[PDB]
């Protein structure tokens, strides 16, 4: 597990699928772009419980969500599809599964797209993101 400070600072998460960081847009639509620079992917993990983050969009004020189809988007209000377990892999970086979907990660695509819920699983490299600083 994570100590604090992991969820003091506001992350960048960078997918080994493309090197894209995991961006939340003002309109609640999520995907991935390489530039680090870009306002967008500033994020906030918040501790829900033991192993268990909400993702937020810092600039946009939206709530990372994984729907019933397998899409992600971001919401305005926190709700039970906004969580996620976070794991440490044993490549040192992180995964984000579904805790309603509990088979499904957070995922990008090499286009930059989103990977939709039931395409993922673990050994993908579209499911791996490493969280860093936001500076």
């Given at each position: 597990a994570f100590p604090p400070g992991h969820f003091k600072e506001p992350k960048r998460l960078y997918c080994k699928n493309g090197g894209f960081f995991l961006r939340i847009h003002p309109d609640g639509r999520v995907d991935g772009v390489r530039?680090?620079?870009?306002?967008?992917?500033k994020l906030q993990l918040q501790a829900e419980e033991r192993g268990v983050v909400s993702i937020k969009g810092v600039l946009a004020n939206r709530y990372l969500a994984m729907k019933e189809d397998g899409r992600l988007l971001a919401s305005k209000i926190v709700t039970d599809e906004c969580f996620f377990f976070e794991r440490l892999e044993s490549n040192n970086y992180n995964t984000y599964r579904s805790r309603?979907?509990?088979?499904?990660y957070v995922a990008l695509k090499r286009t930059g797209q989103y990977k939709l819920g039931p395409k993922t699983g673990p050994g993908?490299?579209?499911?791996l993101f490493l969280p860093m600083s936001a500076k």
């Amino acid at each position: 597990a994570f100590p604090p400070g992991h969820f003091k600072e506001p992350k960048r998460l960078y997918c080994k699928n493309g090197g894209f960081f995991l961006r939340i847009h003002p309109d609640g639509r999520v995907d991935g772009v390489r530039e680090k620079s870009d306002p967008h992917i500033k994020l906030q993990l918040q501790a829900e419980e033991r192993g268990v983050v909400s993702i937020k969009g810092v600039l946009a004020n939206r709530y990372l969500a994984m729907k019933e189809d397998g899409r992600l988007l971001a919401s305005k209000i926190v709700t039970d599809e906004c969580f996620f377990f976070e794991r440490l892999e044993s490549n040192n970086y992180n995964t984000y599964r579904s805790r309603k979907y509990t088979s499904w990660y957070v995922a990008l695509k090499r286009t930059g797209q989103y990977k939709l819920g039931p395409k993922t699983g673990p050994g993908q490299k579209a499911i791996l993101f490493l969280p860093m600083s936001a500076k």
